Amino acid sequence: MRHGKAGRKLNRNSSARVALARAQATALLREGRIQTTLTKAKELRPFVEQLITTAKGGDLHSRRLVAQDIHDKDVVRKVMDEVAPKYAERPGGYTRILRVGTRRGDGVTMALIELV
Amino acid sequence: AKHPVPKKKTSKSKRDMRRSHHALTAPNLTECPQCHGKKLSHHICPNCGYYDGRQVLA
Amino acid sequence: MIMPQSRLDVADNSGAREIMCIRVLNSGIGGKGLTTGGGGNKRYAHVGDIIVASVKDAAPRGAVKAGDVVKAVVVRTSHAIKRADGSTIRFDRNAAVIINNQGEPRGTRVFGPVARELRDRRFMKIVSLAPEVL
Amino acid sequence: MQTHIKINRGELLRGIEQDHTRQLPDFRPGDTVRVDTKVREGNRTRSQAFEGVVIAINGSGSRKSFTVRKISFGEGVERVFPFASPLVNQVTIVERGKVRRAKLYYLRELRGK
Amino acid sequence: MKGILGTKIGMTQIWKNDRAIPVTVVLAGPCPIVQRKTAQTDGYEAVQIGYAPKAERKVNKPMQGHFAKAGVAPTRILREFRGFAPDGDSVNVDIFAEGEKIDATGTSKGKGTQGVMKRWNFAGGPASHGSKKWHRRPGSIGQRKTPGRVYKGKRMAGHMGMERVTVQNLEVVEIRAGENLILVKGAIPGANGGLVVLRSAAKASA
RNA sequence: AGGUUUGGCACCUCGAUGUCGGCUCGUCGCAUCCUGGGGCUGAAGAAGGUCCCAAGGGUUGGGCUGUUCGCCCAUUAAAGCGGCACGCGAGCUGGGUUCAGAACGUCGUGAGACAGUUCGGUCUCUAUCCGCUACGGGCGCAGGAGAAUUGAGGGGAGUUGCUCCUAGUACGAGAGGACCGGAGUGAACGGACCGCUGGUCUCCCUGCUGUCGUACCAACGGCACAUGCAGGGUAGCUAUGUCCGGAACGGAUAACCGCUGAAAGCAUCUAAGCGGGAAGCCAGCCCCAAGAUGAGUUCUCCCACUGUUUAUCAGGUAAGACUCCCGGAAGACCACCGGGUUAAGAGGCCAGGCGUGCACGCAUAGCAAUGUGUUCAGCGGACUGGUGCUCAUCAGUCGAGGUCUUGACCA
RNA sequence: UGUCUCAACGAGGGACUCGGUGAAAUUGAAUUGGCUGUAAAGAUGCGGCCUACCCGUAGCAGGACGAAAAGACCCCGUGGAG
RNA sequence: UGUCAAUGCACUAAGGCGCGCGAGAGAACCCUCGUUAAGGAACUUUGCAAUCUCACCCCGUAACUUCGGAAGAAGGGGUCCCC
RNA sequence: GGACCGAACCGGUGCCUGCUGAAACAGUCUCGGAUGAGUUGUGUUUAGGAGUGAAAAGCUAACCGAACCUGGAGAUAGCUAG
RNA sequence: CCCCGGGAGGGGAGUGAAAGAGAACCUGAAACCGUGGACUUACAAGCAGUCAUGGCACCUUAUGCGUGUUAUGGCGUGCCUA
Ligand SMILES: CC[C@H]1OC(=O)/C=C/[C@H](C)[C@@H](O[C@@H]2O[C@H](C)C[C@H](N(C)C)[C@H]2O)[C@@H](C)C[C@@H](C)C(=O)/C=C/[C@H]2O[C@@H]2[C@]1(O)CO[C@@H]1O[C@H](C)[C@@H](O)[C@@H](OC)[C@H]1OC
Ligand SMILES: [Mg+2]
Ligand SMILES: [Mg+2]
Ligand SMILES: [Mg+2]
Ligand SMILES: [Mg+2]
Ligand SMILES: [Mg+2]
Ligand SMILES: [Mg+2]
Ligand SMILES: [Mg+2]
Ligand SMILES: [Mg+2]
Ligand SMILES: [Mg+2]
Ligand SMILES: [Mg+2]
Ligand SMILES: [Mg+2]
Ligand SMILES: [Mg+2]
Ligand SMILES: [Mg+2]
Ligand SMILES: [Mg+2]
Ligand SMILES: [Mg+2]
Ligand SMILES: [Mg+2]
Ligand SMILES: [Mg+2]
Ligand SMILES: [Mg+2]
Ligand SMILES: [Mg+2]
Ligand SMILES: [Mg+2]
Ligand SMILES: [Mg+2]
Ligand SMILES: [Mg+2]
Ligand SMILES: [Mg+2]
Ligand SMILES: [Mg+2]
Ligand SMILES: [Mg+2]
Ligand SMILES: [Mg+2]
Ligand SMILES: [Mg+2]
Ligand SMILES: [Mg+2]
Ligand SMILES: [Mg+2]
Ligand SMILES: [Mg+2]
Ligand SMILES: [Mg+2]
Ligand SMILES: [Mg+2]
Ligand SMILES: [Mg+2]
Ligand SMILES: [Mg+2]
Ligand SMILES: [Mg+2]
Ligand SMILES: [Mg+2]
Ligand SMILES: [Mg+2]
Ligand SMILES: [Mg+2]
Ligand SMILES: [Mg+2]
Ligand SMILES: [Mg+2]
Ligand SMILES: [Mg+2]
Ligand SMILES: [Mg+2]
Ligand SMILES: [Mg+2]
Ligand SMILES: [Mg+2]
Ligand SMILES: [Mg+2]
Ligand SMILES: [Mg+2]
Ligand SMILES: [Mg+2]
Ligand SMILES: [Mg+2]
Ligand SMILES: [Mg+2]
Ligand SMILES: [Mg+2]
Ligand SMILES: [Mg+2]
Ligand SMILES: [Mg+2]
Ligand SMILES: [Mg+2]
Ligand SMILES: [Mg+2]
Ligand SMILES: [Mg+2]
Ligand SMILES: [Mg+2]
Ligand SMILES: [Mg+2]
Ligand SMILES: [Mg+2]
Ligand SMILES: [Mg+2]
Ligand SMILES: [Mg+2]
Ligand SMILES: [Mg+2]
Ligand SMILES: [Mg+2]
Ligand SMILES: [Mg+2]
Ligand SMILES: [Mg+2]
Ligand SMILES: [Mg+2]
Ligand SMILES: [Mg+2]
Ligand SMILES: [Mg+2]
Ligand SMILES: [Mg+2]
Ligand SMILES: [Mg+2]
Ligand SMILES: [Mg+2]
Ligand SMILES: [Mg+2]
Ligand SMILES: [Mg+2]
Ligand SMILES: [Mg+2]
Ligand SMILES: [Mg+2]
Ligand SMILES: [Mg+2]
Ligand SMILES: [Mg+2]
Ligand SMILES: [Mg+2]
Ligand SMILES: [Mg+2]
Ligand SMILES: [Mg+2]
Ligand SMILES: [Mg+2]
Ligand SMILES: [Mg+2]
Ligand SMILES: [Mg+2]
Ligand SMILES: [Mg+2]
Ligand SMILES: [Mg+2]
Ligand SMILES: [Mg+2]
Ligand SMILES: [Mg+2]
Ligand SMILES: [Mg+2]
Ligand SMILES: [Mg+2]
Ligand SMILES: [Mg+2]
Ligand SMILES: [Mg+2]
Ligand SMILES: [Mg+2]
Ligand SMILES: [Mg+2]
Ligand SMILES: [Mg+2]
Ligand SMILES: [Mg+2]
Ligand SMILES: [Mg+2]
Ligand SMILES: [Mg+2]
Ligand SMILES: [Mg+2]
Ligand SMILES: [Mg+2]
Ligand SMILES: [Mg+2]
Ligand SMILES: [Mg+2]
Ligand SMILES: [Mg+2]
Ligand SMILES: [Mg+2]
Ligand SMILES: [Mg+2]
Ligand SMILES: [Mg+2]
Ligand SMILES: [Mg+2]
Ligand SMILES: [Mg+2]
Ligand SMILES: [Mg+2]
């Protein structure tokens, strides 16, 4: 049974679940938009949304919080001093997804997730 | 050998009997409003890349 | 939740140090003494219930030696005992008090607290001997 | 299948529950006297008191409770009071404790001085 | 006899003369009489009462004209109550009296496809001493050739929960009539936010 | 009489019908262990004996032994007897006896043997059909649709103690000690539920070690499990935790008890007739149910479109669905429920609750390990609302024109 | 001390759904129900009576005297070998 | 690097690899795991299995003996950081 | 020191898992030896009623109470099938 | 030479009596897989046939004549071996 849910196991253990959502947040932040499986995108959406909301605070604490997950110093810098400040007057919804059909090899359906 | 095993070979009729359920569903394709090609719903028109505006290359 | 095989401590000077229960009864003290049982299937001893038990260990210079079968009433569960207002109780160790077939304690005194529920089930003298009816 | 009435079940529960909620002195894992009423002894209303360390606090509203642990004649005891239980008179802070975690069950198997 | 519809809101702690009482809170929101079933017209006596409102933009034309003939706003939910003959509309007010016993019907929380241990209390096999029947796994289902089928109605893995369920002779602890709140002792079937019917205790005590 | 024992016989099975016991799961008989109703008694009461009716439900936990049995412990209303391939190994054990090793006793010159005794010793991932539990698709149910429903029939349930009142009464020299009716509280079992008490809660919060890294310090991340370890822990799920249940009334019956009563001028419960009478039968309680093809009933909706004897039935549409999208205390898939811009569905954002237990940074005290303040701090999964910041875009598929006969009412 | 009363919650790997590749043992043919009876003596397939719309998917193991090895026990052969 | 020592264990350097189907779902059941109220062998043929124990210091250590041993008997204590 | 603990190494104790396997004997866990009657490489010698064997009728090229291959040979088959 | 295709494969054109021989190259049976059409089947119990009758369909050993299919009724225990 499962009448309350944090998201997905994907098909991975606690350690990986994390390492993935971290890496994919890092790439969407470095890259503005990326396409991946529709699932992994839906799973990415709130992690990265909350991450930008953390960095939106400006003080050293929020930067060190972001450093906890985005372990590449330049992406954290960009999110801190570039992207979050831009999202200043935006109350969430930093992120959007749109779906782009189906893949050849596994016949899986990819989609794009991009900064708003 | 193989604990459970089947008893008599199944009939040409009953075998196609079970299969009355494997027909594929055709996509509900629709006409893209800008590229004048066909596209899956709630996805991005592959031909022109458009999705109200235009997101993907080519 | 006392059940057969589970070893209790004795809260009386009756001379057992600790018993091991071997049955779980129904135990109305009931004007002619203890009642006959209330069904042969009850599974768990609670505070206030009576149990049969072997006496696995005993005081040298006893009134009650090792190996006597005996009937003790239970007075301290590690199990929570909840109450009509909402409160719960619970003691660090399970313990009982050996008693005769009219229910009265066999020792001269009880040792440690006893659950107020003993007063509920008319165990007058056990309640009277104990230092605190918690 | 389930009704979809527009409803804040939050505040429906809150109205019920606030009629039977009661606030107490601010303790926090260090010890106190719970003075309380045993109507339970006969038709008379005897009084009795439990002084012990507070080893946890749980819930909120009707449901909030706190847990005292004392030693009576050698055997340890713990008890669980609803703040709003009618069989509870006044709590009062005997002491103030410098504890370092919300729950602090480590004193179950510490019993000493 | 008496009946009404409401949503299950939750369970809490209470007191009445120093007895702690678990209670389930229920919203017996006012119900409207959409249909009246005479025997002389529909072959038996009953009343069709409605519950959770919905906006007419979501109400298709046939249901619209149903509700419209009766003069009522559209309701997401409708039910019949046998032998009721109410008037005006069926509010929980006074329809239940404090301290009444009442039959509470609801819908079991849906537990999906349960095994035999969960479903029928099987208590399958030993977890050591050497099986691969450790978990559920019923033992036998028959007895060799003797009828040589397995019995109809056999207990087996299946869909547990999601059943209709009635629990009889729950007590009415409290009635906040103006709020349309009804406080009932003990548990009621199904999850919060669900539909539930309170009706007069069908097995009235002697 | 039965067919559960040992047997006779040798009928199917030697191109295989796996055998003892346990476990699991049941279900049937009744020649009834308990409960329910009766007759008789060497039946005062109580406690019994024994026979008749009765198969609804119920029928405990351990020691010894492979055991089945049986003896014992401690209970019980009772601790029933049998069938079902001595039920049940494509369901599990493998303790027992029917393989190879080895030993004792015994027999045999021997090889070897057994009525024996003893330690050891491979139990075969994929269900075709039928049968069963769950779940869908199709068609049907004389138009096409959305809902509400009668209940033919079917399933579940069905146990029992203790105490108290009657009443220290009837009864009995006494000790003792009732039926009938009326209360109350338990056990076991079951259904639902998560407020309580608890369990868990694999990354929600903290603490801790080694080592590697983000240049260094400080602060963090990885690995130590598929959580490195430890301490807590919300929603959810959950029992040992709660709440509810077994019925009352009624109809026909069993043994049996009677009324009226002949044959048979008396008598007789039966020969006609009639009443009483059980945990059993039917109904009542809960659940399912019109594929009840005998396909039922009620409220509401949409309505008479179009095509030359050539394509003859199809096609645009209505009412209304469906695909698709976002979700769900729904769920393997399907199905079911909610939302989809005339929008609070979900995420996010805000506020709150709850969990953790006082953050970083700075200051300060101290030689330092650390302590103190800023700070009930900081951080925060699943909880309660609000909010148009994100996605629920745009669209496509499908879906009525109502057969005939007979009868009544109408113009 | 989950072996047990008595099982719960959580994890991962399968099992389930979609896209790719795609076996096997077995198979007289099959339009392959229940009771009772009869039959070479344990009937889907004979008789009577009941029940049952067509077709799947996930699952259970009572039947199909289920599968595997022309019984290793037993007897037989004027069979064999140590 | 750490840890009495070590080719042990943990993390890691150089170096080498992620094991030639993939994506979701988060039912029964099966495997390999983590925790568990009260009870603690009542399980069973048998504590089978799985817990518990666990390294190094210190104190302490029985019947019996072939005087070597039984012996790591049994049991108790310590273990971190700083001056 | 046919002493102790214990890696390598040699081994194979109990349970599970595997049973149309990853594998015609294995895997994880656990367990025995671990300076000796020890482990191992290369070269070489002994064979069919024969060799070897700290001895099970074990092993003698994946099934040894007498190996494999060819041959006598279409052995013989009071037996079963057709 | 031309067309669709990365190719494979094919469709034309041309040679040839013939491509109804095209290099997966004589014939090309059957099992086995498919497409289209006639007649038909979603209340039904079945060794699958057989007899009987009605319906529908077609007429090249062929208009009383059938041939194909079908509904309902009756009847009906595969083959072989032993
Ligand atoms: C399960 C393990 C093996 O089976 C058995 O032990 C036994 C199986 C049956 C039960 C038995 O039947 C019984 O006989 C009785 C005499 C009579 C009885 N009647 C009453 C029905 C009958 O039931 C036998 C004789 C049947 C017959 C077809 C046969 O000979 C099968 C042989 C082998 O395939 C099997 C295995 O599965 C192979 O497992 C092997 O195990 C090794 C350890 C592995 O290394 C591996 O080897 C590489 C693996 O594969 C080979
Ligand atoms: Mg996968
Ligand atoms: Mg780029
Ligand atoms: Mg924030
Ligand atoms: Mg602390
Ligand atoms: Mg559910
Ligand atoms: Mg179990
Ligand atoms: Mg079987
Ligand atoms: Mg049968
Ligand atoms: Mg016989
Ligand atoms: Mg004969
Ligand atoms: Mg055979
Ligand atoms: Mg035998
Ligand atoms: Mg009888
Ligand atoms: Mg009687
Ligand atoms: Mg009497
Ligand atoms: Mg017994
Ligand atoms: Mg013992
Ligand atoms: Mg029986
Ligand atoms: Mg027999
Ligand atoms: Mg048997
Ligand atoms: Mg088998
Ligand atoms: Mg054996
Ligand atoms: Mg001799
Ligand atoms: Mg052994
Ligand atoms: Mg064995
Ligand atoms: Mg498999
Ligand atoms: Mg109509
Ligand atoms: Mg009925
Ligand atoms: Mg029927
Ligand atoms: Mg009196
Ligand atoms: Mg009086
Ligand atoms: Mg008198
Ligand atoms: Mg009475
Ligand atoms: Mg219960
Ligand atoms: Mg239940
Ligand atoms: Mg909780
Ligand atoms: Mg953590
Ligand atoms: Mg660390
Ligand atoms: Mg540092
Ligand atoms: Mg690393
Ligand atoms: Mg590493
Ligand atoms: Mg933890
Ligand atoms: Mg008379
Ligand atoms: Mg009569
Ligand atoms: Mg009567
Ligand atoms: Mg009864
Ligand atoms: Mg009809
Ligand atoms: Mg038409
Ligand atoms: Mg429309
Ligand atoms: Mg929907
Ligand atoms: Mg919808
Ligand atoms: Mg918009
Ligand atoms: Mg809401
Ligand atoms: Mg608004
Ligand atoms: Mg907050
Ligand atoms: Mg200083
Ligand atoms: Mg985080
Ligand atoms: Mg689970
Ligand atoms: Mg899982
Ligand atoms: Mg059929
Ligand atoms: Mg016969
Ligand atoms: Mg038969
Ligand atoms: Mg036939
Ligand atoms: Mg038949
Ligand atoms: Mg039918
Ligand atoms: Mg199976
Ligand atoms: Mg067989
Ligand atoms: Mg033979
Ligand atoms: Mg011879
Ligand atoms: Mg080193
Ligand atoms: Mg190593
Ligand atoms: Mg290499
Ligand atoms: Mg704990
Ligand atoms: Mg102990
Ligand atoms: Mg036992
Ligand atoms: Mg035992
Ligand atoms: Mg034994
Ligand atoms: Mg062991
Ligand atoms: Mg000496
Ligand atoms: Mg010495
Ligand atoms: Mg010894
Ligand atoms: Mg030694
Ligand atoms: Mg040595
Ligand atoms: Mg060896
Ligand atoms: Mg090895
Ligand atoms: Mg050793
Ligand atoms: Mg040794
Ligand atoms: Mg020789
Ligand atoms: Mg060999
Ligand atoms: Mg080879
Ligand atoms: Mg040979
Ligand atoms: Mg020959
Ligand atoms: Mg010759
Ligand atoms: Mg010969
Ligand atoms: Mg070309
Ligand atoms: Mg070509
Ligand atoms: Mg050609
Ligand atoms: Mg040709
Ligand atoms: Mg060919
Ligand atoms: Mg070719
Ligand atoms: Mg070619
Ligand atoms: Mg030629
Ligand atoms: Mg050819
Ligand atoms: Mg066609
Ligand atoms: Mg065809
Ligand atoms: Mg028909
Ligand atoms: Mg026919």
Is B34 annotated as a binding-site member? no
Strands C95-99 and C7-10: parallel
Ligand (nearest to CA of E146): 9
* CA distances in angstroms from A17 to A48, A66, C12, C32, E148, listed in the order given: 14, 18, 59, 70, 51
Distance CA D31, CA E99 (A): 41
Backbone angles phi, psi at C37, to 5 degrees: -50, 165
Is B54 annotated as a binding-site member? no
Residue E163: name the closest of D1, D5, A2 by CA.
D1
Residue D102: name the closest of D12, D28, D10 by CA.
D28
Name the experiment that determined this structure. X-ray
Write out chain A residues lying below 8 Å of E112, CB-based: 1
Protein residues within 5 Å, CB atom, of ion ligand 6: E 110
Chain A 3-62, residues with CB within 8 Å of chain E CB atoms: 3
The DSSP 8-state label assigned to residue D61 in this structure reads G
E runs forming strands in chain E: 3-16, 19-27, 33-37, 46-50, 78-82, 101-107, 113-114, 158-159, 164-176, 181-185, 195-200
Handedness of CA A57, A60, A62, A67 (dihedral sign): positive
CA D72 to chain centre: 19
The number of beta carbons lying within 10 Å of the beta carbon of residue C23 is: 16
Q: Which tokens hold the place of A27?
A: 């790439």
The full DSSP string for A20-51 is HHHHHHHHHHHHSEEEEEHHHHHHHHHHHHHH
| Chains D and B touching, counted as 3 or more CB pairs less than 8 Å apart | no
Q: Which tokens hold the place of E85?
A: 């003959």
Residue A49: name the closest of A34, A35, A64, A28 by CA.
A28
Closest-CA residue of chain E to A1:
E111
* CA distances in angstroms from C72 to C11, C42, E64, E148, listed in the order given: 10, 16, 73, 54
CB E31 within 8 A of CB E51: yes
Task: State whether the beta carbon of E162 lies below 7 angstroms from any atom of strand F.
Answer: yes
Q: Which tokens hold the place of D75?
A: 């055997």
State the distance from the centre of ligand 81 to the C-alpha of E179, rounded, in angstroms. 89
Count how many Cα atoms sit within 13 Å of the Cα of residue E87 in the half-sphere of its side chain: 0
Task: State whether the beta carbon of E88 lies below 7 angstroms from any atom of strand F.
Answer: no
E runs forming strands in chain D: 32-38, 46-58, 65-72, 75-82, 90-92
Protein residues within 5 Å, CB atom, of ion ligand 2: A 11
| Residue E178 contacts D, CB cutoff 8 Å | no
Position of tokens 């009445």? E16
Residues 20-49 of B with CB under 7 A from strand G: 20-21, 24
The full DSSP string for E1-43 is --EEEEEEEEEEEEEETTEEEEEEEEE---B-EEEEE-HHHHS
Closest-CA residue of chain A to E114:
A1
3-class SS at E86? coil
Distance CA B13, CA A9 (A): 43
Distance CA D52, CA D67 (A): 9
The DSSP 8-state label assigned to residue E58 in this structure reads G
In sequence order, the β-bridge partners of residue E169 are none
3-class SS at E95? coil
The full DSSP string for C15-41 is SEEEEEEEEE----B-SSSBPPPS-TT
Specify the number of domains making up chain B: 1
* CA distances in angstroms from D5 to D22, E6, E26, E76, E189, listed in the order given: 31, 9, 12, 9, 18
Handedness of CA E26, E30, E36, E38 (dihedral sign): positive
The edge-to-edge listing of strands for the beta sheet with A95-102 is A33-37, A109-115, A95-102
Q: Which helix (DSSP H) or strand (DSSP E) does residue C51 occupy? A: strand C50-58
Provide Rg for chain B, Cα atoms.
23
Q: How many CB pairs under 8 A join D and E?
A: 77
Is B35 annotated as a binding-site member? yes
How is chain C split among helix, strand and coil, in percent rounded to 5?
5, 35, 55
State the distance from the centre of ligand 36 to the C-alpha of E110, rounded, in angstroms. 14
Closest-CA residue of chain E to D83:
E13
Chain B 5-44, residues with CB within 8 Å of chain A CB atoms: 40, 42-44
With 0-12 / 13-18 / 19 or more C-beta atoms within 10 angstroms meaning exposed / middle / buried, residue B35 is middle
CB D16 within 8 A of CB E181: yes
Q: Which helix (DSSP H) or strand (DSSP E) does residue C75 occupy? A: strand C69-76
Within 8 A by CB and 6+ apart from A110, the residues are A35, A36, A37, A38, A99, A100, A101, A102, A103
With 0-12 / 13-18 / 19 or more C-beta atoms within 10 angstroms meaning exposed / middle / buried, residue D18 is exposed
**Resolution of the experimental structure, in angstroms:** 3.3
Backbone angles phi, psi at A18, to 5 degrees: -65, -55
Kindly report the length of chain C.
134
How is chain D split among helix, strand and coil, in percent rounded to 5?
15, 35, 50
Position of tokens 């002779």? E169
CA E62 to chain centre: 27
In sequence order, the β-bridge partners of residue B31 are B38
